[model samples]
Target chain A: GMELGLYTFADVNPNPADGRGPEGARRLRELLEEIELADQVGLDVFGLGEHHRPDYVVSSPSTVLAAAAVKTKNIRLTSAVSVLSSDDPVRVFQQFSTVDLLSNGRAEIMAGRGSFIESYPLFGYDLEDYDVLFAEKLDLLLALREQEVVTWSGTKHPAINGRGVYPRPLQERLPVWIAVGGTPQSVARAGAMGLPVALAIIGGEYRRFAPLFDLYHEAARRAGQEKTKLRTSINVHGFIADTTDKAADQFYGPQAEVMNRIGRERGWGPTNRAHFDAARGPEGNLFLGEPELVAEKIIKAHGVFKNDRFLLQMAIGLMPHDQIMRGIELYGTKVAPLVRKELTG
Target chain B: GMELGLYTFADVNPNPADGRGPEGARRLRELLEEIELADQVGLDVFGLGEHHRPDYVVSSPSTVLAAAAVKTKNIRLTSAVSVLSSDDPVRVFQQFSTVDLLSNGRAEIMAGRGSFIESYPLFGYDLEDYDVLFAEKLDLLLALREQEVVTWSGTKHPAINGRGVYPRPLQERLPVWIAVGGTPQSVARAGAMGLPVALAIIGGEYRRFAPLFDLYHEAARRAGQEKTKLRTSINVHGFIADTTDKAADQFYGPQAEVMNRIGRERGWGPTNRAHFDAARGPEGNLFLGEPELVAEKIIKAHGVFKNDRFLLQMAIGLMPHDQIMRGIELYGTKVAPLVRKELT
Candidate 1:
């Protein structure tokens, strides 16, 4: 309950200066400043999501995070999820390790089977071998994480015979979490490997994830492991303001417009008033309201899941910078303390 | 005479803030800021040398340069020599292209066989195929630079069936320079490819290397290519100050110490005062003296060689930042303008 975090999709459209473009370069600078503010205000962690399309800019999260490290003081920086399947594990280790060095041992990474398919062709990866690619790459990444001289051959990457990757992380071992979106195999794999799990609860109720955590702990127990130190994060579209109704009115209009626009491409029904109401109301997973309302909801979610970490997905479809800063401020200052007090009492 | 560039190696030992130790990181940052000041004054380009040894912190020059790009605006950034023999060309393209995008087309790259042998084992490259590795990789790099779909099959690299590298550079084509350290084959290769030539004239009279530039231009002309865009940068170790005698005295002590220290490892002869005087005098290639004197010598060197660039190798052998920055401010504000005026 006390270790609640905030996550942002620092989406930069390649055309960063275009009309009302949600993915502008200005948005990047704004979001980084907001994250720096969040760190100063006592947020536990800041996670940046990955996107590769022309409409969304951040193809290199480590580069952005490196810039953020110079300005940030305490909050840990982690990639919301680095698309591991399409990128080289060796290069990924080097970049993240370099960031860890710059940040003085505060760098963490969450590797995932990314949602976007554009990266497959963009980086010369075959979509058919997506499963094998993630498996082999994750194995290589784990091997590299030990910071030892590696001498092994693999299917997807060039064979390295007794070569060590360098500028080894400042931390004795960098903490790596697997961002699993409800895959039993992934949860079991993370459990067996002793890696922390960050559940991407983008579209489901908080209670629905309790059984998944149960499965994770059971797998770890069966493997003769100690009680798993599992960390949970929910990536729900959220907004915060003075009151629940005002926050809903401010966010629902823009969120629905963007959702319906994207839904047209995915062939979903158009977003309407009822849909927006469900999304903001108790029925939907969206966390839209004042600081107290959001904090109470987070405490309830944390209690139900018995989770160690909670990441509020503060960046939802075109939410302005002012809105993000307000939410981050409330969550870090007001909500976090409330959750901590509730947990303690 | 105005467009020449020189490079320095940012050697970091270890720094504590980075947990590598503070000495190395602090020194590296100070050196970079000094070098940036150098570029801001009037230097057309500044280059960073790459090294993988534990004593030297900069394992990746492009990474350092990427950080530097955000701090400065005008000077073109380049790697003095990326060890292409032990690295991947595709990855090099990616990194340099990213730098190019960051700097808004101010990125330049000089690919060469590095002066050190440690990277071979570190990156698992066999020393046996050194020549073949460089040639095959350079060939692949030339193909990749076209910024089109490339289908290159080389002995050293995997078959790129038909794929283009990305975040394609902001420029139509990146300026690729070849650093030749008194190698005729390397010079002719640069000329044949119509790329700029950066002659590393480290230890000799400036006139001694005039014939190599002749060969470079002659080779380019005979190859029926555009006249070679020749850039001559001397990589000698020295510093500058208010007067010739004081500058020489300050630099001589530490320069001699570093020379003897390195000489022991490579079993080379000791560097005496005579050698130092020879390097610092009119006949010497080292840029060490008062601003006016250094400026006059550079102008003189430009006249004899007809070289388009003059990269002042200001940092060498643990020269401190205060002295380095003084040299930069003097070089940019005083020396460069004087040289340009005298040359014209």
Candidate 2:
């Protein structure tokens, strides 16, 4: 029922001693290693997030993925969320199409209206047209995928008058997933539009999001879409290690640092050990613990959501490289086997 | 006096029998292999061009260069010309900056007011503002390379106010070159601005273009700029093989097809075998022949123009992959050592 994978924001280490040159290069190099390892351990997909800040090294996900496309063989490469609203759909499609050719059709796009606001102004896009921008651009993006010589019109973007996009993807139709953050309107629209949905459940109980999946499928059914296009994914935050307590302890400091730093920016309350411990429990959204516990929760959550894919963000904030590597190894080697056997067998 | 390298528009063959899917994929795969072989054979730099028409495979040079960046070790990666007038400078800087980090600071941008007009409409730019667009964008591109936080404003593009461009290049200042097509104003502007120049000489006698270099140096000297920034490259169309006859024969059909096809589009008179033969001669711009002859011409051209770089277009207009590979091998393994010895 699940195509298991992992995604990362590729958080840049904030430490001053590590110069940005080494820091960013090392982060990108380590990211390649992580993708390689994920593919080696029989994982299905590896997604890289896009961020336009010093704290994260990736602004162009497909550019970095094109490098990874040559290094690995089978695992599908995708942008965890290619902030599509503020970006030109033409450039995005062309870059990913290039990745598809390089990877021999192992590329997908998980487009999201980015949670951050920096890209809006960076590319001269206004946040006032955030929703309208996504609506129009998503229409064009889908249109670009549908044909080579696109004849499209939109108020926000420059209209294309039957110009052919070069280097058509190796895949007849490139896989595109709609990534939404607990928004029913987005979820239903994704289903209505006949696109797969990746619902991010970063907080609250896992069961609380089941209704969104139901709504998604119901909307798809009402629209008479093919059942094959109804794939759903749950992307969340968590880590894995040798044991539950060790996973909890190793994950807390860095994750908490990120939470606090971003929380300070968003004016959210500070998180401490009490809240962290509660969130990592059996009923919580945090998918942390040893292999057995995490695997059990993944199976249990799959039963509720009936999701086709599950992705974890194990590397958040200033987590050490070696530790992230170890977490990825355990997640792939241990958690993946157990979950697959139970769910499929 | 020259960094021997190669560039291609990655000409897509017009034969419809090869479906675009397999055709385009094979071309890109072969391109990566060509770059790898260039690096293996000790070539100094490899440049890829930007084109939007169906006849060429590359619309985004940096995206392909990003793939080549990881596959190669030493060869510097660059866009032969990035059609800067129609594209956003910030995106160009960010993508090339990413390539710089990927290749450990071996990335460059050759900015141009693209020769073709396809991108002008594709990116919603007008042909009327061509010169102004390149001038403004090149200025912003220079500023973006100079600072991590760019505060750039131009009439052609949106103002970037105190915005921090992420992932600064590994090189203290990523190199930017001005690519021109026999334009004196563009040549002098590049020199006065203290940037490297890549002058394209696709036709006529080589001596005719030497005056442009002199004007470039004079402009730099008059502007009181350092000599280090006045690096010049002579980019031309050519091929090399085991013998002079075979090199000329193999390069002629594909090249003439391209010239004729483009000529039809641009309303230029048709070119024939006689014209092609003359252009391939000792006094001509086409750098075609065996290794020694091609190397001698490069060394002779460098003596006249004193260009610091020499780039040849070996894969123009559907030259077969194997021929391009053979030409590159000769250029790097044989021609490079000869030119390097004579020039240095």
Candidate 3:
């Protein structure tokens, strides 16, 4: 069975995508409705990302998700990736634990080193220490979830002396998943820890990332991790609509606008309409199509990665509110059923 | 005119109170109902305190308040006192700001030095730097409320390099009142800063604390802070019911248990019924009685302090859930109307 879901940065800004004022309040209100719709439509999970920059809407995902927690029943809420390197594990544990209570065990934390580097300076961390920070914080996070009274020491974070973490998770163990972006070491590390993993592909071909899973299983076995039955997710991009034409172009502009803008920052070559359109074709990575076609692509990713879950980042940045709603609408009503039936039946 | 309200820590743990594990969830569920009943009864505000101990149910006040925000209407929600010294101002501002958006503009942060010192160690701060921690953090918090993009530097906390604090509060400024027990320097500082102040009395004779208010106003005048007008609040402990006897005895047990327990921690003598009863007397501090008597005592406290608002900590700890509910019910249906009528 496939676990299909949606993820976003909740990208929002002043009109014209320029740096302006506080529009996140409005973005979050719409996002809550979007999550509620996903729950209504029978989606398995919904995740939000963390970005401190102005163009992005959510810096605090749990705060936003806790707001979503009370409204939706059954749909698991997670951070597409909580930037764990710069965050305090105790605070992170407490926040998700609170959401777990509010949502009745529907909270998950997808910890990542994060693709961007802006958070380091903002939270008073050195960019050079990114690897160490993530390794140490993940250690603390795991220990805190396993035991209520945590006593541990690491070079990156302050030491705790048998301190009690309050309001334990409703679930026996709070589920943590490692999110990786084309990193073999990160993938193997997740497997070595026996933690769940998420493979995020933003720009590459979908089929190429399949071998990382084999590496994962090998490393897990090497580390003596009890990973007899493991779960993994493939998170990628694209949107949905009643038909392909209306969305693929409308969504391409919103998605490409962000890519080009961020590409300029990351020093990538210009992304044009041809590359975008080519990716939506057969055997390409983008999950953009009507119900039948999208279902087929989901199945293709299922074959390639053997992922138990496929989470689509419907809009990479601030797509229009109505389009975002329709993206969710199509994900639930149209794509979910076709995919589930094709897999099971 | 005066505003009346109630505050609590929503305490949970096994006791003669007789509830067992998973009581915090049950406690929170009942606490939401209590807040709603207060709104239904027309109280002006409700506040929840934060404590990280296992005995206390809430460590995150704004998260609890955001849950309360959706269910409450009109009544302002505040941290009885957010311990600013140990917490990050950015997170503090963001949490309350998020609550402000959730509640449609009824969120406030009553920042305080905190009576209990447990949070200092829990959040990794030395108790010796308490004064500077509070002074500098309050500066950042006020700036956060007043401006959208803040560039601030403080010794105890990180310096913000002109970053924008997101999701600006719904109100132009989220009302942040300083909660003081009885320090003249703390009172004068609140006065000098022109921030609203809350005088919290856990136990003391009622009239003896009046000059603290005078010192507050006087400091405001001398600092050229503006003698035009200032708003003040007096927060104390008590409960109300159909009869004074039932209310007094029932509340005394829960109140005394907490006082004696906390007394041991703070090195105070064992408290008994006589002092508790004396505190509830005409000129004593506790606002214990039925609607009429509670209303009269509120008026007397006003006469001495000339405070604009009075908030009661309805239960100190481990009160029966239904009794807490009835406490709010009587306070709303029986207490608020009489107090408003008598004050005006």
Candidate 4:
């Protein structure tokens, strides 16, 4: 079976009339309804991101996930990456554990240092210690997952001596994956700690990281750990529809504009047709195309990486809900089956 | 129409076998469902309390209220009394505002210093500064409600300027009530601040507090506030049933035992039959008895106090769910109408 997932950034558009405003939250509700449809057609997981800005509405991903839990049955629900650097581990555990109970054990969470710095000042944290903050918080979170009395503290957080958090999860141990955007240290840390790693490959060639997966397994073995089975997933910009030309026409204008605008702010050169072509080519990470076209690429990538999971970053960079839902439906119904058949053969 | 509300203490029963464990969150969910039934049957509001203890499971009332908001419509939700003294006003504003959005402007909050002292060390507060903590936090909360740029500093809290909180409430300003447990000063303070007052009348004659209500109004008028339009609600312990006999049989023993147990710990006298009877009488504060009997008593009390709001302290004494639901149904369908008719 092929594990297919959907990713949402909960982006709040500057203009509500621009198809992703309050209308966007309503569209999100519709998108969740579409996810229910995807689950019925057999999708593996659904992921939503955490953002604290006014432009991005979903500051409380657990609240949204809890609502989604009631509407869908089988698809595993998760935070694309809960920003552990700026949040409390106890609170993170409690919220996801609550989600686990609400969803009948279909809950997991991926923790990361968020891409934005807005949450640090808002939640009363120092930005300079971002790396240390995530490291210590992740340690505490791992201890919390044991569902036992935790008795340790770091300089960043209050010291606790034998305190157990409330509402233990339905799962014996809720699965947690660490999401890293192509940092060798991060991948090695995940491997050393025996945690699954999710790679974010937004603008790159897939073959460029073939050796990193090998390092992940070797690190896990050398750490004297029981060769913790590593499950890899990648997040790439993607869209889908009935015809390749129609899909590209529907996606390119809006998606490319958002990418180039963000690129300009971050000092990257303007995004052009050639850059877009590279992302859609055989070596590139972007998954934009028709169902069969995307499916063929996914099958090829899976054979090279031997990854059990593939997460389509469908919600980032101004992708409309209508387009996103079409991609989700196609991935679950068409791409998923094709990839599954190829993997089995 | 009378304003009736439900209240919860998040009382952690020390007894785990009683279905009030950490896992008892499911029971809390079940209780909220029953409360939703009450709202559907015409109850005005549902309230949940906060406690930082293990026995009483609800440490975070917003989480529970968030869940409740999803399950019901048109029912105003509130915290029986959020411990404002021990919490951050900014976070409180964000949470209640989120609840307000979820419920479509049906959110209300009651702020109090809380009766228990355990939350002090649990949340890292000093008991000696109780008065100051509440005074400053309440000031900050009131300022934040205006949804303007709040720039203020106190001895306790850090100074902030131009920082607007997120998830702004749907309402222009969320309704806030201060819960005063029989302190004339607290009542006067609430009146002066232009906030409503909820009198926690755990025991005694309800008529003795007529002067306190008057003082509240007088204080409001003195503070140059409009004639004290303070909405008054009273919280009392009790249960209701179709008949007087069944009501007494279901509540008297358990209620007395629970009361006396707390009384002993607090250095009060044991709860006896005479006290229980007095409490069930017309002048007594406990809202216990048959539908008609309770209705008549509520009408008499409302008439005496001229307060339309009456909140039944219906749960959190380790009372069983079946008994609690029966009381809710009786209160919503029978007692409420009877009292309304008699008052008219």
Candidate 5:
């Protein structure tokens, strides 16, 4: 059997004039509604990513998720990518631990060397030490979780002197998954640690990412990690509605706007209808279609990866509420049943 | 009339034999129920203070309060003390800002120089820079709330240059009150900033603290600030039950245990029932009693302190749930009505 869920960055559209600033109050209200509906429709997980940019609302992922933890039941809460390179592992553990206590053992962390560079300077860490920082922080987070009193040292962050981190999680041990974007080292690291992986397939051929999971599994075996303990989840950017055209029509505008804006920042070609249409095709990476079509793409991907879970990164930029609600309804009611039955049978 | 409320550190008695370590699942469940009942009984505000010690459950006050924000209505949620001395002001603003959005504008930050020293070493800061750290952080926090973009510099902390703090609170300005442990300087700082003050008096004669509130007023006037702008509050350690005898009986065990433990750390004399009995009398600081007795103490304190709000720091240690629940029930149902009727 397989589990399905959704994650969002809670992107702000900058509508500050209504009362509070852009994407601040109203957007959060919509987000709370989305999470409530996700729980109602039975999504297994909901994650909020961290971003320091003014365009995104959440900087403290656990703070937002703690709010959701009380409102939600049964849905596992996680950080989409905690940007571990620039953050304190102790604070992260304590926060997610607090969330676990609030939600009664339904909390997880998805660690990543974040996609953006803004958080580094904001938190006073050098970009040169990114890889080392993440490695050390990951080790530290695991140590803190496994022991009540942690004694460790690191370069960028200070040393912990056998101090007990408080308010431990309700779960025996809080679940952690590595979030990667085809980074071989990251994927291999997750495998070597025997930690679960959330492989992000935002673009390019989705089938190519299968080898990434293979690398993960192979590394785990080589490290003598338990095979049963290893798990894999593949997350992709897409939307779902009642039909193919409605999904495409509602998703394309904000998706293109975001891609083009990010392209301007990253120096890429402008996104257009041709690229969008091609991506929506069967072999393309986008999951923009109704329940059956999206479900088929997920099943096909699962067949190659044999992953334990699949997560959809929903509404990249300020997706309308009603369309998102309907999409979640279909994903839970129509898409999940098909995928689970097909996988089990 | 006066605003009445309660704040707890959400103290946890670890019962790991039932699984889950430290202040595990059961404690948080009870804390949530406590907040829910506080709102149900119509308390004006509810707060959670921060601590980093294993003996106390909450290290992340805003994170825990964010959980309470959704389940609560008609109660202004706040941190009794956010220990601003060793914390990141940017993160603090963002967190309480997030809480404001979640609660639709019912969040506050009560900045304090922490009463405990564990946080200083844990977050990597020197005790020597305690005063400077708090001053700089408090200024930065105010800036983050007042403007979207900030340019701030301090002696110890790094400088910020024209960066916007996002997801601003729903309130025009998220209310901030300085929490003081009967410190004249802390009281004076709150006045100079025209910020509200929450003067905490856990020991000593209650009436002597009146001059501290007076100092706050005088400082505000000297600073050329409006009298109407400066608000004062008195928070004291207390427990309330149906009757005076029951209140003392239910509270003394936990109170004595915590006081002795902290006394051992601070090199103070051990407390006994007589001292506890004396503290419960009308002139003493403790507010444990029946509704009328508690109300009389509050009114008498108000006559001197002239404070606008009274916050009871409930449950110094791990209090039994039923005792705390009955206390909250009597607080709203019996005490609040009497206080409001007399004051108004």
Candidate 6:
């Protein structure tokens, strides 16, 4: 069976000069309603991104997810990517474990080396040790979930001499999915460690990334890992609306603004309408359009990648609350049934 | 008017030998219900204790407080005392600041040199630097609350050179109170810094702690701080039931078990039923009795110390849930009105 879900960065307008305005508060209120609506519409999962910038409302995903945990009944809550490189694994495990308790075992952690590097300095880490930092933290995180007391040591974190972490998660073993962005080494490592992998494709053609999934299974096979331990998710950005034109038009302005703003920082060329339209085509990464069109493309991608889960990042760069709400309703009510009929049925 | 509230360590039976049992999860679920009931009963504040030991459920006060913030309305949520020495101030500020956002500004942080030192070794802090760890961390925590972009340097904590901390609190400034346990130097330091103080008295008579409030005020006065900034709270252990006899007996078994269990570890004598009964008397620290009796003692304590707040710890070691609920109901509906009427 295929699982459909949604993820978001919880974008917001920047706060006032003093950073004491009501923008983040208002956005957080809206974020809760979005998660509740997703659960109501039968979405399987809802993930939130972790960012330290003023433009993003959530820095601590588990805290916000704890609030969501009590509010939603069935939808699984996770961090889209908990920038695990710069954070302490013990704290991460405890927080998510607490969220799991609050959610009654519906919690998961999608640990990743974040695409943005702002968190590196914010939490006092160097960009030079990015890969090693994530590797070591993920190692400890896995150890913490396996047993009550943990005894692990690494170059990055302080050694825990068989210290017990409290308020154990309700789940027998909390799910830890490795999130990667076209990084073959990262994908292979996730497979070798027998962990779920969430491949995030925000650009390039979808088919070009298909081989990475093959590499994933091959690595697992070589390591003699159990087949049940291997799970895959494709997380990408797009929107759904009443019709194809409406989604394209509504998603274009905000999506372009985000790309151009981030591009200006990274010195990439500004994204244009032509490039945006091309990206929404059959072979492209964007999943935007009418419900049927989006569903058909998702089915096509599933055929190519064989991913167990599909997470769409629809609420990118200040998408209006009402439009995002409708997109969720359509995703869960309309697109989900179409895809499930094509694949599962 | 004096504020009346409740605090709990959220005590649970230690887990099974493997430390994976349903006791903690069950206690946390009940804890949320207790806080919600306190809010419904119109209690002024609800505080939770932070402990790393398996016997106590909560380790991160702000995390639990964040959950409590959304579930509760009108009741101020605070960590009974956040063990600030071993934790990072930056992380603490962000967490409480997030709780303040969800709570619409009813979040507060009560920092203290924790009475139990399990967190010190667990978080990799040395007990020898206990006072300095608290002092240095407190310095950085104060800076975090005062400004969004903080530039702070400390010996123990890594220096932050003008890096902005996110999601500023809803209030103009989040309140941070110093919780002390008969430490005069801590009391004076809190007063001198113009921060609020919460004095926890688990043993001995209540009257003997009055002069410490005097020392607090005198220190603040010497520091030339505004009088409005000075606030004091008395947190103690006790319970309230329908009658005096029921209150004394019902509170004794669990209370005695806790004291003796910790006493054996600390090399103190075991307590008996006779000592428990004496503690429930008028002058003793235990605030257990019927609503009227407990209210009278609170008013009496206020007259002596002029404290602004009173928090009673009723949910100690294995106290029955239904009994605690009734005690909370009485504390809010009966005790609060009498004390407020007498004081105002």
- The candidate scoring highest on DockQ is 2
- If the candidates were sorted by their DockQ against the true structure, best first, what order would they fall in? 2, 5, 6, 3, 4, 1
Cα lDDT, all candidates: 0.70, 0.86, 0.80, 0.73, 0.83, 0.85
Worst ten in a row by lDDT for model 3 chain B: B14-23
- Model 6's CAPRI class is medium
What candidate 6 gets wrong by more than 4 Å, as runs, is: A15-19, A254-271, B16-21
Number of clashes recorded per candidate: 11, 0, 0, 6, 1, 0
**Model 2, A257-314: lDDT tens per residue?**
6565432433444466566666788988789999999999999998889899999988
Provide the lDDT at A281 for model 3. Answer: 81
lDDT (10s digit) by residue, model 4, range A26-75: 54455566567777878888887777555555555665576566567799
TM-score of chain A of each: 0.91, 0.95, 0.94, 0.92, 0.95, 0.95
Evaluated against the true structure, the overall lDDT of model 2 is: 0.86
Taking all chains together, the TM-score of candidate 5 against the true structure is: 0.96
> Against the hidden true structure, what lDDT does model 4 obtain?
0.73
Worst 10 residues of 1 chain B by lDDT: B13-22
lDDT of 4 at A41: 78
Better of 4 and 6 by lDDT: 6
DockQ of each: 0.23, 0.71, 0.40, 0.24, 0.64, 0.55
Model 3 has an lDDT value of 0.80
Better of 4 and 6 by TM-score: 6
Q: What's the TM for chain B in candidate 2?
A: 0.98
Candidate whose TM-score is highest: 2
TM-score of 3: 0.93
Error of 2 at A249 (Å): 1.7
For model 2, how does the per-residue alpha-carbon lDDT over B51-138 read when each residue is reduced to its tens digit? 8877777888998998999899999999998999888788888899889888988999998865688887677778999989988988
Give me the chain B TM-score of candidate 6.
Answer: 0.98
- For residue B78, give model 6's deviation from the true position in Å: 0.9
Error of 6 at B31 (Å): 1.1
State the lDDT of candidate 6 residue by residue for B1-344, as single tens digits: 78889999889887454444366667778888899999999999999877877678787777777788788879999999898988878778878887888787898999997678777655677899988999999999999889878888868877787788877778888899999968678789988999999999878888999889999999999999899879999999999999998998898989998999888878899998878877888899899899999998998888888999999999999999999999999999999988888887
What is the lDDT for A243 in model 3?
Answer: 85
